[PDB]
Amino acid sequence: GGKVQIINK
Amino acid sequence: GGKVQIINK
Amino acid sequence: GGKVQIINK
Amino acid sequence: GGKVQIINK
Amino acid sequence: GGKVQIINK
Amino acid sequence: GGKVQIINK
Amino acid sequence: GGKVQIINK
Amino acid sequence: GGKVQIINK
Amino acid sequence: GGKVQIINK
Amino acid sequence: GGKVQIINK
Amino acid sequence: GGKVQIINK
Amino acid sequence: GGKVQIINK
Amino acid sequence: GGKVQIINK
Amino acid sequence: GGKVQIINK
Amino acid sequence: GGKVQIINK
Amino acid sequence: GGKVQIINK
Amino acid sequence: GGKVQIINK
Amino acid sequence: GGKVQIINK
Amino acid sequence: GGKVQIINK
Amino acid sequence: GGKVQIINK
Amino acid sequence: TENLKHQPGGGKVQIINK
Amino acid sequence: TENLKHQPGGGKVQIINK
Amino acid sequence: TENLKHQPGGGKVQIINK
Amino acid sequence: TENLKHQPGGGKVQIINK
Amino acid sequence: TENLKHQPGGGKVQIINK
Amino acid sequence: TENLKHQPGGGKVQIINK
Amino acid sequence: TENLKHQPGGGKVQIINK
Amino acid sequence: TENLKHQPGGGKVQIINK
Amino acid sequence: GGKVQIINK
Amino acid sequence: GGKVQIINK
Amino acid sequence: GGKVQIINK
Amino acid sequence: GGKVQIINK
Amino acid sequence: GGKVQIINK
Amino acid sequence: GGKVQIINK
Amino acid sequence: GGKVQIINK
Amino acid sequence: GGKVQIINK
Amino acid sequence: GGKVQIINK
Amino acid sequence: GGKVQIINK
Amino acid sequence: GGKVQIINK
Amino acid sequence: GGKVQIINK
Amino acid sequence: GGKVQIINK
Amino acid sequence: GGKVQIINK
Amino acid sequence: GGKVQIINK
Amino acid sequence: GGKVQIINK
Amino acid sequence: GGKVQIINK
Amino acid sequence: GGKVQIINK
Amino acid sequence: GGKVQIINK
Amino acid sequence: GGKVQIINK
C-alpha cells in the first residue's frame, strides 16, 4: 500500500 | 497499509 | 494499518 | 491500527 | 490564531 | 491564521 | 493563512 | 494563502 | 554561534 | 552560543 | 555562524 | 557562515 | 567544542 | 566543551 | 568546533 | 570547523 | 507478523 | 511477514 | 513477505 | 515478496 | 558423539561520549 | 562424531563521540 | 568427520566522530 | 572428511568523521 | 580515560578420543 | 582517551582422534 | 584518542586423525 | 586520533590425516 | 574401537 | 578403528 | 583404520 | 587406511 | 636461562 | 639463554 | 643465545 | 646467536 | 593383532 | 598384524 | 602386516 | 607387508 | 649436572 | 653439564 | 656442555 | 659445546 | 654376557 | 659379549 | 664382541 | 668384532 519515503534538508 | 517515513532538518 | 514515522529537527 | 512515532527537537 | 491540529492514530 | 493540519494514520 | 494539510497514511 | 496539500499514501 | 534546531509547527 | 532545541508547537 | 535546522511546517 | 538547512513547508 | 547528535533505529 | 545527544531504538 | 549528526536506519 | 551529516538506510 | 526494531552492538 | 529494521554494529 | 532495512557495520 | 534495503560494511 | 560449544553472546563494547 | 563450535556473538566495538 | 566451526559475529568497529 | 570453517562475520571498520 | 579490556583466555578446546 | 582492547587468546581448537 | 584493538590469537585449528 | 587494529593471529588451519 | 596415546609436554 | 600417537612439545 | 604419528617441536 | 608420520620443527 | 615447554591448545 | 618449546594450536 | 622451537598451527 | 625453528601453519 | 609395545633394556 | 614397537637396548 | 618399528641399540 | 622401520645401531 | 628425558616406548 | 632428550620409540 | 636430541625410531 | 640432532629412523 | 650401563647424568 | 654403554650427560 | 658406546653429551 | 662409537657432542 505504498511506501513513500522523503528526505529533505 | 503504507509505510511513510520522513526525515527533514 | 500504516506505520508512519517522522524525524524533523 | 497505525503506529506513528515522531522525533523532533 | 491558526487552528493547529495534528492527529496521530 | 493558517489551518495547519497533519494526520499520521 | 494558507491551509497547509499533509496526510501520511 | 496558498493551499499546500501533500498526501503520502 | 551555536546550533539552533527550532521547529515552528 | 549554546544549542537551543525549541519546538513551538 | 552556527548551523540552524529550522523547519517551518 | 554556517550551514542553514531551513525547510519552509 | 564538541556537539554531536546520533540517531539510529 | 562536550555536548552530545545519542538516541537509538 | 565539532558538530556532527549521524542518522541510519 | 567540523560539521558533517551522514545518512544511510 | 508484526514490526520489530533492534539495535545490537 | 512484517517489516523489520535492524542496526548491528 | 514484508519490507526490511538493515545497516550492518 | 517485499522491499528491502541493506548497507553492509 | 556431539560436542557443541557456543559463544552467541552479544558483543562487548567500550563507549566514550563527552 | 559432531564437534560444533560457535562464535556468532555480535561485534565488539569501541566508540568515541565528542 | 563433522567438525563445524563458526565465527558469523557481526564486525568489530572503532568509531570516532567529533 | 567434514571440516567446515566459517568467518561470515560482517566487516570490521574504523570510522572518522569530524 | 583509560578504558582497558583484555581477553587473554587460554582458548576453548573440544577434544574427542575414540 | 586510551581505549584499549586485546584478544590474545590461546586460540580455539577442536581435535578428533579416531 | 588512542583507540587500540588487538587480535593476536593463537589461531583456530580443527584436526582429524583417523 | 590513533585508531589502531591488529589481526596477527596464528592463522586458521584444518588438517586431516587418514 | 581404536587406540589413542597422547603425550604432550 | 585406527591408532593415534600424538607427541607434541 | 590408519595410523598416525605426529611429532612437532 | 594409510599411514601418516608428520615431523615439524 | 631456562627450559620451557609451553603447549596451548 | 634458554631452551624453549612452545606449541600453540 | 637460546634454542627455540615454536610451532603455531 | 641462537638456533631458531619457527613453524607457523 | 595387539599393538604390542615391549622394551628390553 | 599389530603395530609392534619394541626396543632392545 | 604390522607397522613394526623396533630398535636394536 | 608392514611398513617396517627398524634401526640397528 | 644437566637434564635429560626419554619417551622410550 | 648439558641437556639431551630421546624419542627412541 | 651442549644440547642434543634423537628421534631414533 | 655444541648442538646436534638426529632423525635416524 | 649382558652388560648394560645406562647413565643419565 | 654385550657391552652397551649408553650415557646421556 | 659387541662394543656399543652411545654418548650424547 | 663390533666396535661402534657414536658420540653426539
- Give residues with Cβ within 8 angstroms of D9, minimum separation 6: C9, I5, I7, J5, J7
Q: Which amino acid appears at position B4 of this protein?
A: V
Q: In the complex, which subunits touch AC with 3 or more CB pairs below 8 angstroms?
A: Y, Z, AD, AG
Tell me, what DSSP letter sits at residue X11? P
U9 CB within 8 Å of a chain Q CB: no
Query: Nearest residue on chain U to Z3, judged by CA atoms?
Result: U14
Q: Which cell is R2 given?
A: 512484517
Q: What are phi and psi of AA11, to 5 degrees?
A: 85, 150
> What is the C-alpha separation between AU4 and AN9, in angstroms, rounded?
8
Burial X3-15 (b: 16+ CB within 10 A, else e): bebeeebbebbbb
Q: How buried is R1 (Cβ within 10 angstroms: 0-12 exposed, 13-18 middle, 19+ buried)?
A: exposed
Q: Which amino acid appears at position Y16 of this protein?
A: I
> What is the C-alpha separation between AA7 and AG6, in angstroms, rounded?
20
- Å between R6 CA and nearest CA of chain S: 5
Quickly list H helices, Y1-18.
none
Three-point CA angle C3, C5, D1, nearest 5°: 25
- Å between Q3 CA and nearest CA of chain R: 5
> What is the C-alpha separation between U14 and M2, in angstroms, rounded?
19
Decide if O2 and X18 are in contact by the 8 Å CB cutoff: yes
AQ6 CB within 8 Å of a chain AV CB: yes
Name chain AT contacts of AO6, Cβ cutoff 8 Å.
Answer: 8
DSSP string, H1-9: ----EEEE-
> What is the C-alpha separation between N5 and M4, in angstroms, rounded?
6
Provide the resolution (angstroms): 3.9
> What is the C-alpha separation between K5 and L4, in angstroms, rounded?
6
Query: Nearest residue on chain H to B2, judged by CA atoms?
Result: H9
Name chain AG contacts of Z11, Cβ cutoff 8 Å.
Answer: 8-9
Q: Which cell is U7 given?
A: 559463544
- Å between AC4 CA and nearest CA of chain AG: 18
A9 CB within 8 Å of a chain L CB: yes
What Rg, from alpha-carbon coordinates, does chain E have?
8
For chain M, give the number of residues. Answer: 9
**Can you tell me whether residue AA10 is helix, strand or coil?**
coil
Please, are residues AM4 and AN2 in contact by the beta-carbon 8 Å criterion? yes
Name chain AA contacts of AB14, Cβ cutoff 8 Å.
Answer: 13-15
Decide if AN3 and AM3 are in contact by the 8 Å CB cutoff: yes
AB18 CB within 8 Å of a chain AF CB: yes
Query: Nearest residue on chain O to S5, judged by CA atoms?
Result: O9
Three-point CA angle T5, T6, T7, nearest 5°: 135
* X13-14: strand order across its sheet: U13-14, V13-14, W13-14, X13-14
- Å between AP5 CA and nearest CA of chain AO: 5
S7 CB within 8 Å of a chain W CB: no
**Can you tell me whether residue U5 is helix, strand or coil?**
strand
Taking residue AT2's Cβ as centre, other Cβ atoms within 10 Å add up to 12
Q: Which amino acid appears at position AT2 of this protein?
A: G
DSSP string, C1-9: ---EEEEE-
Q: What are phi and psi of AK6, to 5 degrees?
A: -125, 135
What is the phi-psi region of residue Z10: left when phi exceeds 0, alpha when psi lies from -120 to 50, beta otherwise? Answer: alpha
Name chain AI contacts of AB11, Cβ cutoff 8 Å.
Answer: 8-9
Quickly list H helices, AO1-9.
none
Query: Nearest residue on chain S to T7, judged by CA atoms?
Result: S7
Q: Which of Z16, R4, G9 is nearest to B4 (CA)?
A: G9
> What is the C-alpha separation between M4 and I7, in angstroms, rounded?
19
DSSP string, Q1-9: ---EEEEE-
> What is the C-alpha separation between AV5 and AV9, in angstroms, rounded?
12
Task: Give Cα AS9 to chain centroid, integer Å.
Answer: 12
Query: Nearest residue on chain AR to AV8, judged by CA atoms?
Result: AR4
Q: How far is CA W16 from CA E2, M6, W8, X18, in A?
A: 45, 12, 25, 8
AB17 CB within 8 Å of a chain X CB: no
Y16 CB within 8 Å of a chain AG CB: no
**Can you tell me whether residue V9 is helix, strand or coil?**
coil
